[PDB]
C-alpha cells in the first residue's frame, strides 16, 4: 500500500492525483481485456463506453499517461545534436517588432504636441501612458485641477484633433 501509493505519487515528472493514476491503470486493464477480445487494439470509441461511457475524456487521459522526453537526449546517428538545440525560445523578443513599436512612440509624441496641454492631458490619463494604469473617469476629472468634468469636454476637443495626424496617415501605417 505504501509502495503503490508512493509510486503513483512520485514517479510522474508532472504530478497527477491518486485517482487520475487509478483511472489510467483501469484504462490499461480494460484495454488488455478488449485486446484479447477483438484481435486488434480497440478504438477510443470502444474503450470509452465500457468503463466511463465518455469518449472525449479517454483521448484526454491517454495524453495524461504520456511520459515526457528529455531535452538533453540526442539523436542516435550523430552524438552532437541534442533536442534542446532545436527549441525556439518563444519568449525572446523580435527585433523588428519591438523597434516598430518604438517608432510608434515617435508618432504619438507628434500627437502630444498638436494637442493642447489640456488635450494631451486626458489622453495620458485614461489610457495610461506614463501611468501604466487606466483610471476610472469619475476619478480622473476630480484628480485633475479642472472640474465640471471639463476633462471629458476636452476629450471631444481632441478626438477630431487626432484625425489630423490620422489624415497624415502616419498612424494609419502602424495598424496594418
Amino acid at each position: 500500500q505504501a509502495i503503490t501509493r508512493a509510486m503513483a505519487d512520485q514517479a510522474r515528472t508532472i504530478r497527477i492525483p491518486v485517482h487520475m493514476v487509478e483511472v489510467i491503470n483501469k484504462l490499461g486493464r480494460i484495454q488488455r481485456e478488449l485486446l484479447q477480445d477483438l484481435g486488434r487494439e480497440p478504438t477510443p470509441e470502444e474503450l470509452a463506453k465500457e468503463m466511463d461511457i465518455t469518449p472525449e475524456k479517454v483521448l484526454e487521459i491517454q495524453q495524461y499517461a504520456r511520459e515526457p522526453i528529455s531535452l538533453d537526449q540526442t539523436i542516435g546517428d550523430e552524438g552532437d545534436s541534442q533536442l534542446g538545440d532545436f527549441i525556439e525560445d518563444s519568449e525572446a523578443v523580435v527585433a523588428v517588432d519591438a523597434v516598430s513599436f518604438t517608432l510608434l512612440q515617435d508618432q504619438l509624441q507628434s500627437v502630444l504636441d498638436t494637442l493642447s496641454e489640456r488635450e494631451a492631458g486626458v489622453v495620458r490619463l485614461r489610457f495610461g501612458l506614463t501611468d501604466g494604469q487606466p483610471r476610472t473617469l469619475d476619478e480622473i476629472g476630480q484628480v485633475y485641477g479642472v472640474t465640471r468634468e471639463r476633462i471629458r469636454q476636452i476629450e471631444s476637443k481632441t478626438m477630431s484633433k487626432l484625425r489630423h495626424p490620422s489624415r497624415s496617415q502616419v498612424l494609419r501605417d502602424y495598424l496594418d
Binding site: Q10, R12, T13, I14, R15, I16, P17, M20, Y64, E91, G128, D131, G132, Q133
Partner: protein, 96 residues
C-alpha cells in the same frame, strides 16, 4: 551595467553563502500542475521563489498590470518583475 570589471574571483561556496543566494527553499519535488499547467507552489518551478511566469503577472492573478512594480502580492507572495528574473534567481534545498 558597465563592461569593465577588473577581476573575476572563484572560491569554495559556504553553506551560508548558499542560503544568501536563494530566494527560497524548494520543499516539494513537484514541478507543475497536471491540469492548470502552472508552476506548483514551493516546487521546482514555484513562482514565489524564482519569479513570475508572465511579465508582471502574479501567480494567483490578483495583480496583472504593469502598474504594480516591485509589489509582493500577499495571497501568493510573487514579486512583480519580468520572467526575465527566472534566469537569475537561485534556489536551495535544506538537507536534514
Amino acid at each position: 551595467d558597465v563592461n569593465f570589471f577588473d577581476e573575476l574571483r572563484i572560491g569554495l561556496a559556504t553553506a551560508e553563502d548558499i542560503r544568501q543566494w536563494s530566494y527560497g527553499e524548494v520543499k516539494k519535488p513537484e514541478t507543475i500542475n497536471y491540469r492548470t499547467l502552472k508552476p506548483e507552489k514551493d516546487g521546482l518551478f514555484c513562482e514565489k521563489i524564482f519569479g513570475p511566469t508572465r511579465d508582471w503577472e502574479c501567480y494567483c492573478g490578483k495583480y496583472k498590470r504593469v502598474r504594480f512594480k516591485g509589489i509582493i502580492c500577499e495571497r501568493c507572495g510573487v514579486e512583480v518583475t519580468r520572467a526575465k528574473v527566472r534566469r537569475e534567481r537561485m534556489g536551495h534545498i535544506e538537507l536534514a
